[PDB]
């Protein structure tokens, strides 16, 4: 079986321009575990992005958290680009400061 990831892009704290924060991309509920997750700043891939160790839920589907430290500004747009065998094109989810 294959299950598409659910994708959530959010900050660790409620966003405040000029104050350091973390940008998260949480992928859950997918199978198989082969996945590519990238954070984008104004459409450009951020280079130092960490991720959690691969784990899974009771239904056996996988979840991962990708994250990076950042400082939001008024004019910077962030997104998460998720690449998975169930997505015919990578899905790019923009960051909405109230989700």
């Amino acid at each position: 079986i294959q299950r598409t990831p659910k994708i959530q892009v959010y900050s660790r704290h409620p966003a405040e321009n000029g104050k350091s924060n973390f940008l998260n991309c949480y992928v859950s509920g997918f199978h198989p575990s082969d996945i590519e997750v990238d954070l984008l700043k104004n459409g450009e891939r951020i280079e130092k992005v960490e991720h959690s160790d691969l784990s899974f839920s009771k239904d056996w589907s996988f979840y991962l958290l990708y994250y990076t430290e950042f400082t939001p500004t008024e004019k910077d747009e962030y997104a998460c680009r998720v690449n998975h065998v169930t997505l015919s094109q990578p899905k790019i989810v923009k960051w909405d400061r109230d989700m």
Binding site: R12, Y26, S28, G29, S33, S52, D53, L54, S55, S61
Partner: protein, 274 residues
């Protein structure tokens, strides 16, 4: 008052690209504390929580021995499962295992687990009586009678009822400050018009631990599922969790909707109203 320990392992075959990759993690409740990755350089079990670093060098040697052994066992199991299902060595496949235990508030044994899934779906699982197996298909029935004849369940009882609950007890004592605390959710509501007829109301819970929580919307005091949206509980990254629940309401009727928040850390369920 009750607690859990789980170990999760994932073996993934990569045909034409080396030996299968094996990743295992361990958790007490919603707190990860160890990891192993067969592709990493160290080839060791590694701490992922501050309170497990107390453990001395004999612990890390022994736990490393055990997880590497599991990695070789499940590489074999990938090949056997390939034979059971009559599949080619060309394709990539996944074997996941979970095992662990639950304890009550008084620390006594509550339940033990020892379960496999192949390509994302139930394969074989130890039943709650720690005597018998539930097998998902005819492939797993092969394994079920092999393991019944060899009494594999009985040979797991000492771990599940002894080592597991003893380890879990020790961890809960060593990490009381982290593991035995409850962080209540910090809650707020947001409000966005989406046209001149309707608005979105969004109920937030932030910074809570453990992850278990319930958000529900009521309209005039009756539960409301129509036009509601509930996202999966997600990690903040700092050890706590987040969730929200939203509802689209007629413009001007915001005050008849209430969001109700229940969490371990709250001595009283919270009620929010715009």
């Amino acid at each position: 008052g009750s607690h859990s320990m789980r170990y999760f392992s994932t073996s993934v075959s990569r045909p034409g690209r080396g030996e299968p990759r094996f990743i295992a993690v361990g958790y007490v409740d919603d707190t990860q504390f160890v990891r192993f990755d067969s592709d990493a350089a160290s080839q060791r079990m590694e701490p992922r929580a501050p309170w497990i670093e107390q453990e001395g060098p004999e612990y890390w040697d022994e736990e490393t021995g055990k997880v590497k052994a599991h990695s070789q066992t499940d590489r074999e199991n990938l090949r056997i499962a390939l034979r059971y299902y009559n599949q080619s060595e060309a394709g990539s496949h996944t074997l996941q295992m979970m095992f662990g235990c639950d304890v009550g508030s008084d620390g006594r044994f509550l339940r033990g687990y020892h379960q496999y899934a192949y390509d994302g779906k139930d394969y074989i699982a130890l039943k709650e009586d720690l005597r018998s197996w539930t097998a998902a298909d005819m492939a797993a029935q092969i394994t079920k009678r092999k393991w019944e004849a060899a009494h594999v369940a009985e040979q797991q009882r000492a771990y599940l009822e002894g080592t597991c609950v003893d380890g879990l007890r020790r961890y809960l004592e060593n990490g009381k400050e982290t593991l035995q605390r409850t962080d209540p959710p910090k809650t707020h509501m947001t409000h966005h018009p989406i046209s001149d007829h309707e608005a979105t109301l969004r109920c937030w819970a932030l910074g809570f631990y453990p992850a278990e929580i319930t958000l529900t919307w009521q309209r005039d005091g009756e539960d409301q599922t129509q036009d509601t949206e509930l996202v999966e509980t997600r990690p903040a990254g700092d050890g706590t969790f987040q969730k929200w629940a939203a509802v689209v309401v007629p413009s001007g009727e915001e005050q008849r909707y209430t969001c109700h928040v229940q969490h371990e850390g709250l001595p009283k369920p919270l009620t929010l109203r715009w």
